[PDB]
Amino acid sequence: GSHMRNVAAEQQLRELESTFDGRLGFVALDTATGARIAHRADERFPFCSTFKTMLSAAVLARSAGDAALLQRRIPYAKRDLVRYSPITEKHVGAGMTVAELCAATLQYSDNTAANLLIALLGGPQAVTAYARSIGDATFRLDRRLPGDERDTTTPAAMAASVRRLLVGDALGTAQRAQLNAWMLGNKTGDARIRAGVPAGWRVADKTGTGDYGTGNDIGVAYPPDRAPIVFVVYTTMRSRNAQARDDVIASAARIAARAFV
Ligand SMILES: CC(C)(O/N=C(\C(=O)NCB(O)O)c1csc(N)n1)C(=O)O
Residues with a CB atom less than 6 Å from ligand 1: 48-49, 82-84, 109, 111, 144, 207-211
Question: What domains lie within the chain, and their CATH numbers?
Answer: 1-261 (3.40.710.10)
Q: Are 74 and 120 in contact (CB under 8 A)?
A: yes
Sign of CA dihedral 38, 44, 50, 55: positive
Burial label, 223 (beta-carbon count in 10 A; 0-12, 13-18, 19+): middle
Q: Which of 178, 140, 183 lies closest to 158 in space, CA to CA?
A: 140
Residue 100, sorted as left (phi over 0), alpha (psi -120 to 50) or beta, turns out to be alpha
SS3 (DSSP) at 199:
coil
Task: Specify the resolution in Å.
Answer: 1.7
Q: Are 237 and 21 in contact (CB under 8 A)?
A: yes
Give the number of other CB atoms < 10 A from CB of residue 86.
Answer: 14
Residue 69 gets which letter from DSSP? G
Cα within 13 Å of Cα(160), Cβ side? 15
Q: Which of 145, 128, 131, 146 lies closest to 23 in space, CA to CA?
A: 146
Ligand 1 atom closest to the Cα of residue 151 is 16
The reply to whether 49 belongs to the active site is yes
Q: What are the E-state strand segments in the chain?
A: 22-30, 35-39, 45-46, 73-76, 93-97, 152-153, 202-210, 214-222, 229-237
| Amino acid in position 98 | V
Q: How far apart are CA 79 and CA 225, in angstroms?
A: 49
Give the number of other CB atoms < 10 A from CB of residue 251.
Answer: 18
How far is ligand 1, taken at its centre, from the CA of residue 208, in Å?
9
Give the number of other CB atoms < 10 A from CB of residue 258.
Answer: 15
What phi and psi, each to the nearest 5 degrees, are found at residue 81? Answer: -70, 140
Length of the chain: 261
Ligand 1 atom closest to the Cα of residue 216 is 12
Q: Are 208 and 47 in contact (CB under 8 A)?
A: yes
Sign of CA dihedral 97, 182, 164, 66: positive
Catalytic residue, chosen from 2, 18, 49, 133, is 49
- The technique by which this structure was obtained is X-ray
Q: Are 44 and 12 in contact (CB under 8 A)?
A: no
Sign of CA dihedral 200, 205, 210, 214: negative
Q: How far apart are CA 53 and CA 245, in angstroms?
A: 21
Q: Which of 139, 162, 176, 140 lies closest to 28 in space, CA to CA?
A: 162
